[PDB]
Assembly symmetry: C3
Homo-oligomer: 455 residues x 3
């Protein structure tokens, strides 16, 4: 026998129902091998990789990651790849778990407006990455051409309350993190393995705030976790919880009771979580600058009764989650669009700066700008801020130390530089502060900050 | 007892037969512990790390990786290290799996023209990296000073049809990838972990094309897989197949049925593959820019009958394998040598450009230059190419977009920039295109391209 | 049941005794669940990250890594975090192994001079990283805010002879490796994952020479191994030995008989070592430029009888361990302090250069400067050195090749450049050589070298 030796296909041909992230198709719930027809279409399109930041993604099914495919070990899969006629590039597919050269690549080569097909038997149970394998392969994967296929064991997976679909990728923009506008792919950064963004499901905030995954206290969650790369290895981790089980691809080995697990580039794992106490559980790449400086954070939000005997503490806030504690940062998108249109108002800037102030400034100056007398000076009704708004731009870009006097009190501390903030971000944060807490109002422009940065 | 407590050496002293990659010594096939005498000589020498690219390697036994050593758990090993008198540097050896300080390092210190010896008992079964441990250690490992020793279990490994020897390394050249000439080691890139090449067995194409590993449908293959580093961790992966078994060093744990496995820097694994359908199975570091932009791809070629019930698709071609689909790129070596000699002919350039055109240009313009009317413009009998050969140099270096007219048809698409191509590569590709498909002939020089790149 | 369902706390409340690295609290040795009160204080302070190199660390309990916490699965932990009033920054804590949002983060937010508390039940047995989770999280972790908590299984761990505490971190200084002075945190290098130092226990040499860990032949050692990151994954390895067992966090899976093991960023493992033969066993990150160029090396020194049947070789020396073979490099600290004070003597420079010469120069020129006639020229009574001390500065910075004559003998070899040596290091090494072996004496200044480097 080969593995997956369950006989020829029986029953009727099945048209696979594919799902967009973060959702998963229902279990196949089948005791016989089937001919499964899969139809997947490549679409090239602009999407928001961050608020006010567009990127030309190349997608399987219009999403990053691509549509989720779910079949049964021993199935015969008739794979149809279409390339939308709006595409500029040819594309193909390499599915992990396929037995045969290129995992489908040579037979699935598809020009814009064409369709290709190949047939394979799913011999190998497991969770598997699929991706484009068109020269230059790294460019296609970097632009978002990856997803997951699940080959179920014949008896199916154990029932759980929720199944979700989460995939990490590293992304390479010409511009710096959160630099606004349409950002080209940067080949130099990709070859050097120096990503500008590291993301779950193709965007900053794709799985935070009002887009969090949900479950209730007492329920079981299974997450199909992919690492599309192209280049990075994920120190994949859940903050404040533990995985009951971690199983890689279709491996025989199952690790139980771990919190931190390494997912290779092109790798995939099935993780199981039991909800015990309510709150936000953060999925991160624990290579920490990825999670906290490049976007690599997703949320599983658990609702239900607190258990003070297990955990007496509060729900996560802007101290740890920064500007992603809030439901969304839609005001940044709106302020960026208004800048492009030449219609940016003070209130556009105030609402964008309000979103960006959380964590970034609030951890020390507080959400109300009061600070802590003698320790963190106030931004609320600040005489020092009002006396010199241009000095305030320098303070954000280049930091501040030494003795100062604010509202009649001496400070002798250190505010670190925040030079990685973009000109629009500094301008919008300071406009928010000037228009809050009885401050004098007016505005700071991106152009004002550009000139102070240039020194 | 210590582990490997099999008594004193018996029988006759055995002179170990060492093998060069990718071959392995035969199984020891022995029921008693032996005194094994190992003789390994360090040689410093220039070799081709890529076509027309030389590098001064430092080698154990004249190869990268070094000669394969095969002994039995419980053996007494008398290790002789010689340093060839042509060497400039002192060398030594640290074998993983040795019980004792430095794994041999202090007692194996060997100046040019000298010999050292130390004795160790092989207590620990497993596959193990050995490497040089001479200050500065990273420089010696970076220049190729690593290989594998297998310590067999007393009963031997299970029989297989083929055993092969494959070792990844990261390499640091002063010049960029495929920049021609003798390339010095670059300490700055090595300290930053920014390799110019990531290779299997010490060269681009060492295990591709006419140097592929072979087996037949139905046969079992065991690969001894090393990661010499110095710095990178391999997302080690087989395209289009699965590993029956993966076992790290002499670990008790064996993973079964996985496709993608992380091999630490200085780590080693034994993988087992069963051949099911014919074609090329690609071994890669799935940190994808390594595999597709820095050389990290090897081939296991399976011959035998197709099974359309398991896989209906075609053998891999230049779409996925690029310029390594072909048997070899010997024309690039020959054109580089002719440039050095000042004897470079048009035909030298044409044959080199023919090799480099595969994948790099052919994925969109086709192997015959016809393109796809209205989608990818033709290079065959191209009026647009002929009208301005200098514009063609700019197009390759800097890309092209917007409306153009080629052979009476409008195109409105995007050709990405290919600025990572070296001046000789652009010149040779364009000379190939000009001398093919009824194009006007003539030639483009490396110097022509240097001037266009300088703008 | 939840896991760790051992009933309510019994007995008396226990004030946890915490230990500084590399020591561990004694086993809890308890058959009942307890209320454990933990008190940990954040201190910001300058410490030596290398000889003559200061850094402002942020610490849990005044050390990097932070104080070790030891409790029993099923314990109720009342966690008190104090922030010393000298602190400039707010801090908090996220303990892996805590069941609840942020692992403690929202409830442990603590301004300078304040205290916070939260209670959690230790449901999950294992070894776990804890760290600060205050925006910007990567900055706090990069400055040293991490350590380990052990949650014992109810029956306790198996008895061993020694338990030690070793934690890797990556560090980001504005200055280059071993550049002297107070070094600021460098956000740009941290975001790029380009550390200047990779260290065990917060400093170069923290666990080498006279600070090595100890045990005797025949004894068992358990090491609690953390990777605080923030960014790097450790190819964690013991030179010249094997781990009996490696267990990650509280995972069910235990790997036995491995030498090289990958520890994720934010991960932790318990390793077990049996001492077989005497000597220094080096713990490294086998991403080799970290271990040999950035400080990532620690020593377990085994005393006892040699066993020539297992290993005939010598103890490690400066060939493999370089300048860390010696007990300490205190002369470098003293010479750096004397430079700051403007009191640097020739003898200050000689003793610092003596420390730095080991490995760096001695591997080729020998510890006595004799070299090897015709192969490595002498530094002892060197006519070539004496004839031009300025040429000697160029040779160290930029290397030397080609035919030379030294003390009546021709050399035709290659000395690699050592441009990564700092101006003070070149000046002190050459002053050592000039004042040794009947050389003419005098001195080379850091300023002399600065001018030669500037060309
Ligand atoms: C702690 C880590 C802080 C963060 C984050 C931010 N700021 Fe700050 N800021 C902080 C200190 C300790 C000080 C005083 C420094 C000293 O020399 O003692 C400051 C100072 C300012 C000021 C000027 C003083 C005042 O008006 O109160 C301004 C205008 C200011 N900070 C603004 C500001 C903004 C907008 C922030 C986010 C972008 C921000 N700060 C972050 C401590 C900390
Ligand atoms: C697809 C990803 C392509 C690859 C790889 C290469 N080329 Fe290309 N090329 C492509 C397009 C879509 C276009 C037209 C762009 C537009 O504005 O619509 C081009 C154009 C050229 C041209 C000029 C037009 C012509 O003569 O047909 C030349 C001379 C050319 N391309 C050459 C070329 C070479 C030599 C390549 C490898 C080095 C190469 N191209 C790659 C699409 C793609
Ligand atoms: C081997 C890897 C070496 C290391 C490490 C260092 N040196 Fe060296 N040095 C070496 C060689 C082979 C040569 C001769 C090169 C040639 O062209 O043949 C040298 C030369 C020098 C010299 C000049 C000659 C002499 O006086 O003997 C000096 C002053 C010198 N080397 C000093 C030196 C110092 C101070 C080192 C550590 C910083 C050092 N060398 C390292 C080989 C090697
Ligand atoms: Cu594609
Ligand atoms: Cu793949
Ligand atoms: Cu060597
Ligand atoms: Cu090693
Ligand atoms: Cu902190
Ligand atoms: Cu953490």
């Amino acid at each position: 026998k080969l593995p997956g030796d369950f006989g020829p296909p029986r029953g009727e041909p099945i048209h696979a129902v594919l799902t967009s992230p973060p959702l998963v198709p229902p279990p196949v719930n089948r005791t016989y091998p089937a001919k499964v027809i899969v139809e997947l279409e490549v679409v090239e399109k602009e999407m928001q990789i961050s608020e006010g930041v567009s990127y030309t993604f190349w997608t399987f099914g219009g999403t990053v990651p691509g549509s989720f495919i779910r079949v049964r070990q021993g199935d015969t899969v008739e794979f149809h790849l279409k390339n939308h006629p709006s595409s500029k590039m040819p594309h193909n597919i390499d599915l992990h778990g396929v037995t045969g050269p290129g995992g489908g690549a040579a037979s699935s080569f598809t020009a814009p407006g064409h369709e290709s097909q190949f047939t394979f038997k799913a011999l190998n149970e497991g969770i598997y990455v699929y991706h484009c394998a068109t020269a230059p392969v790294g460019m296609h994967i970097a632009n978002g051409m990856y997803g997951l296929i699940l080959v179920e064991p014949p008896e199916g997976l154990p029932k759980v309350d929720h199944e979700y679909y989460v995939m990490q990728g590293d992304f390479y923009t010409a511009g710096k993190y959160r630099e606004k506008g349409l950002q080209p792919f940067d080949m130099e950064k990709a070859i050097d393995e120096r990503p500008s963004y590291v993301l779950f499901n193709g965007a900053e905030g794709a799985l935070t705030g009002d887009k969090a995954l949900h479950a209730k206290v007492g329920e079981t969650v299974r997450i199909f976790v992919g690492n599309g790369g192209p280049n990075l290895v994920s120190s994949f981790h859940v903050i404040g919880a533990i995985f009951d089980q971690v199983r890689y691809e279709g491996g025989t080995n199952v690790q139980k009771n771990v919190q931190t697990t390494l997912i290779p580039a092109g790798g995939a794992a099935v993780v199981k979580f039991t909800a015990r106490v309510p709150g936000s559980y953060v999925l991160v790449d624990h290579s920490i600058f990825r999670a906290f400086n490049k976007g690599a954070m997703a949320i599983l939000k658990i609702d239900g009764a607190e258990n003070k005997l297990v955990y007496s503490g509060k729900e996560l806030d802007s101290v740890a989650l920064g500007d992603r504690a809030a439901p969304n940062m839609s005001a940044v998108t709106k302020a960026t669009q208004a800048s492009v249109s030449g219609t940016l108002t003070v209130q556009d800037q105030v609402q964008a700066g309000r979103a960006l102030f959380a964590g970034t400034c609030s951890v020390c100056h507080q959400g109300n700008g009061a600070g802590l007398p003698g320790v963190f000076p106030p931004l609320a009704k600040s005489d020092f801020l009002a006396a010199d708004p241009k000095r305030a731009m320098n303070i954000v870009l280049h930091g501040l130390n030494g003795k100062i006097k604010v509202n009649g009190q001496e400070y002798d501390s250190v505010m670190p530089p925040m030079t990685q903030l973009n000109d629009d971000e500094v301008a919008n944060i300071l406009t928010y502060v000037l228009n809050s807490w009885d401050n004098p109002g007016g505005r700071v422009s991106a152009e004002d900050v550009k000139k102070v940065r240039a020194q």
